[PDB]
Design an enzyme around this catalytic site. Sequence first.
Site, short mmCIF file in Angstrom:
data_model
loop_
_atom_site.label_atom_id
_atom_site.label_comp_id
_atom_site.label_asym_id
_atom_site.label_seq_id
_atom_site.Cartn_x
_atom_site.Cartn_y
_atom_site.Cartn_z
N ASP A 32 0.84 -1.18 0.00
CA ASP A 32 0.00 0.00 0.00
C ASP A 32 0.90 1.26 0.00
O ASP A 32 2.04 1.22 -0.48
CB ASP A 32 -0.99 -0.11 1.18
CG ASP A 32 -2.33 0.53 0.93
OD1 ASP A 32 -2.33 1.77 0.77
OD2 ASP A 32 -3.36 -0.17 0.92
N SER A 215 -11.17 -1.26 -0.58
CA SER A 215 -9.89 -1.25 0.14
C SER A 215 -10.03 -1.48 1.62
O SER A 215 -9.07 -1.93 2.26
CB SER A 215 -9.19 0.08 -0.04
OG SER A 215 -8.60 0.25 -1.31
#
Length: 269
Positions: A32, A215
Amino acid sequence: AQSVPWGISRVQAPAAHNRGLTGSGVKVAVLDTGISTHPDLNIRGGASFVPGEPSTQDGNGHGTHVAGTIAALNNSIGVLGVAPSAELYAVKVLGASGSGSVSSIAQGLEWAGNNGMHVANLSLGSPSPSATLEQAVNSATSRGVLVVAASGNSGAGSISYPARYANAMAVGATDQNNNRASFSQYGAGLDIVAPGVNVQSTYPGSTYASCNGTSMATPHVAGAAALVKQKNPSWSNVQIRNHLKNTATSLGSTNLYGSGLVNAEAATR
Ligand SMILES: *Cc1ccc(-c2ccc(C)cn2)nc1
Ligand SMILES: [Ca+2]
Ligand SMILES: [Cl-]
């Protein structure tokens, strides 16, 4: 005081915690924007593949938020992750803008496979396929990593890459009614769903914030995978993935929800 975000309860993580299952001994990489130091996170290591951002600290916020859904510490502050004792690794593949490249993501996946990760959370994706990315998903899978990826936020009835690939476990988002969130991509390749609306988690500046997205759903499943791995240390990525699907609660068609809502209680019974 600590509070338990609604999604953590919805996936029934507290029941697993009560059985002594916390994700202890399980290595989970968050691929990420980084993970920031935070009093409700324990970051064990990691690496950066974003040129010009050599630190694994989070200049965006997204990766810190995702990390807290997996593994916010079980204590007297903040929030609580699905797998609060998971061994958390910050694998920076997206820059402070929130974007990266398929090359950086692939390098993060290769790092995961070379560093003993059991789970890799990929709260990221694109509508288009990538040979570079696919190769790295497959390589990580061959090295025993369970790759868990977000279906995407376009609302379409096809899912993003890398979630679409067979060796990724694709996660869509549900709301508090156990309906598909409007934005949650669905269709072929979708494996499971988890809470992805108004999800409170850790955020940089030593604070907490609420976000919507696939997400946010993805890390619930990554965390649930870590609970299953702690219970069943001999299991492979495939066995864990299958068990999460087999123990999920049906919510409707396989096309909208895959196997349905992840259920950490049923998966660790
Ligand atoms: C300055 C600042 C603070 C917080 C945020 C934020 C909060 C929550 C979500 C989902 C995204 N961004 N952005 C900027
Ligand atoms: Ca906490
Ligand atoms: Cl940096």
